[PDB]
Amino acid sequence: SGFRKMAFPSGKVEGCMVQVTCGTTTLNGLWLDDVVYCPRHVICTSEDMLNPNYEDLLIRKSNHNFLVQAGNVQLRVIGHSMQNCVLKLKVDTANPKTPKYKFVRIQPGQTFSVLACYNGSPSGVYQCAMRPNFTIKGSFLNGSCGSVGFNIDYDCVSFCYMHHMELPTGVHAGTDLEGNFYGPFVDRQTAQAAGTDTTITVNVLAWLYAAVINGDRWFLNRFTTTLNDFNLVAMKYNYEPLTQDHVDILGPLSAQTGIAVLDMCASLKELLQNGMNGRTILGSALLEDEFTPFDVVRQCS
Amino acid sequence: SGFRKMAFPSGKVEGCMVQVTCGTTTLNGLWLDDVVYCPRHVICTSEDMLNPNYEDLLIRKSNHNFLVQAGNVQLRVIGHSMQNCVLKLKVDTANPKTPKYKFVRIQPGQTFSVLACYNGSPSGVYQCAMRPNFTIKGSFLNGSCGSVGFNIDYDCVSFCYMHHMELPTGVHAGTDLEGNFYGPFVDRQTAQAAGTDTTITVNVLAWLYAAVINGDRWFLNRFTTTLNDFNLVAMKYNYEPLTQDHVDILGPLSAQTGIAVLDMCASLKELLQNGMNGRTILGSALLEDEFTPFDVVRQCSGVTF
Ligand SMILES: *C(=O)[C@H](C[C@@H]1CCNC1=O)NC(=O)[C@H](CC1CCCCC1)NC(=O)c1cc2ccccc2[nH]1
Ligand SMILES: *C(=O)[C@H](C[C@@H]1CCNC1=O)NC(=O)[C@H](CC1CCCCC1)NC(=O)c1cc2ccccc2[nH]1
């Protein structure tokens, strides 16, 4: 029993982190086979922050302008190319610690683990979710760029995020491992603002199911709702719409607990109206939205 | 910026986990040098949960009664002995992935990372605190016994916890790696209950400092207090007493933020007596007590291992 925000074990990713330096900029790179992936803004200088022409900047670089270090060993860059907003540095040696892996682009509401790194070495590991507005609420300082987010279902590592920047409101933006940003952001230091953050409704419902599984029932009620009436209410609290896909996805948890999905929606509606009245759910006094239905099933069984 | 409940990177520990099976029971072991450590209750049968004399049951057991598997390779057990509530199985080969390590016993209020494992395979990692009542509020299912808790300092892994059991209230109990239980618990099938828990005051204060460092400042005020005055309020609200050592340890954070400890104590006193009035701190609607002062320092300065 118990319920914790649980990350994946980080060892398979730790063995892939390296340090990449270009000019005076140092950040992290991901070394898989004979390629090191890192944010392309490592090639920017202090005058190229607003409107960098990355194709023009990259063509001027030599292989030896990139210093790549794995532990106390320099890797020799033998080639470079850019794919969207990531740089791919070809090196002369394959990483012997490369795990089984794939690159996956995730949808808002999906969760993943982040291995926060500085100078190629790990600082710590934590869980994150892709917010509906395509930001993540991370913990990242200067030098963290190039840290990755990942899931490890099975023994396969699915890389889904690479860190690039912090928006003025304190949240974070980045790309997939093909170099495409999540959301409308660009790798320029120009004024950019994320959409209004909303709550990930299907994840709140998953977490209420987790609470029942762990023995807690105080928030249940005798009512039900239609899906359309639920959405009319939840949007007034800046909750994301719940779709029929979401209802289908909660079928398994509904079957395990004997609580129909639309009956749990009626519980959530009352919680939004009443608050918690000095109570907690799974040790929280707010409704958590960073556990997916899949996460709940992994942890509770 | 930002602030998250952050676990230590687990790679150094993952390479030490193995599976240990005795009779019908399977759980995890920790393989360091040429010894595998696991809970001694692995030896119990259904007719020994009630009241077992493990020292008598261990004589009856022979080396080949312990199946140890590291991945798909079987380790050969060449000896066995007990240390308190931990079984030590000597194996014929040293773990080539053994990290620099030591065994340490932690104090209540200290935090550590748990590598939850099943069948010898690491499954997830999260940060815990040793509660004042000597339990931990973990997430553990059947087959997780022998999962371990650890801290890392530079290149050194300090192992501090091995998991043994779940109490009726759903919190968890275990031992250090020399097999001494944390708290007034025993490894017998019997009625056991956690003591009433209290909140870790020095950790709440550290987290309030983390909040200010991240620009969350609504709870600060003009007032200050004394230790005696504060501690009288603490006792009233089931908070752990705040000592002078605690004030000293927060010293850094006080100087960095310009909020003296007793100044921040006056903030915490008001939060206790008045609550949060519908506001949050670092995304929480409760006062969080599972970050130590050192936890805050290393997250806010980007310390690596
Ligand atoms: C890479 O290591 C950092 C990671 C940042 C530092 C603070 N927290 C983080 O997550 N990335 C940056 O510093 C980028 C660099 C830019 C180079 C040119 C192309 C765009 C990215 N900058 C920022 O994240 C940045 C600058 C800035 C100024 C004012 C407010 C916010 C802000 N964020
Ligand atoms: C080891 O893998 C498990 C871990 C437990 C399973 C559920 N959650 C956990 O953390 N440990 C056990 O199952 C122990 C075994 C005992 C054998 C005899 C010596 C003491 C340990 N049992 C329990 O944890 C247990 C039994 C029990 C009965 C009623 C309420 C709670 C309860 N916990």
Author numbering:
A (entry chain A): 1 to 301
B (entry chain B): 1 to 305
Article excerpt on this structure:
This observation highlights a flexibility that allows bofutrelvir to engage both the backbone amide nitrogen and carbonyl oxygen atoms for hydrogen bonding without clashing with the substituted Val166 side chain of the E166V mutant. In comparison, the presence of a saturating concentration (100 µM) of nirmatrelvir, ensitrelvir, and bofutrelvir greatly stabilized wild-type Mpro and increased Tm to 71.5°C (ΔTm = 18.5°C), 68.2°C (ΔTm = 15.2°C), and 70.3°C (ΔTm = 17.3°C), respectively, reflecting the high-affinity binding of these drugs (covalent for nirmatrelvir and bofutrelvir).
The main/3C-like protease (Mpro/3CLpro) of severe acute respiratory syndrome coronavirus 2 (SARS-CoV-2) is responsible for making 11 out of 14 cleavage events for liberating and activating the viral non-structural proteins essential for the virus replication, and accordingly, it is an important target for antiviral drugs (1–4). Clinically relevant SARS-CoV-2 Mpro inhibitors, including nirmatrelvir, the active component of the Food and Drug Administration-approved drug Paxlovid, and ensitrelvir, which has been approved in Japan for the treatment of coronavirus disease 2019, target the cysteine protease active site of Mpro to competitively block its catalytic activity. Multiple studies have identified an Mpro mutation (E166V) that confers strong resistance to clinically relevant inhibitors, including nirmatrelvir, but the underlying mechanism is not fully understood. Glu166 is also hydrogen-bonded with the N-terminal Ser1 of the dimer partner to stabilize the Mpro homodimer and intramolecularly with His172 to stabilize its active site.
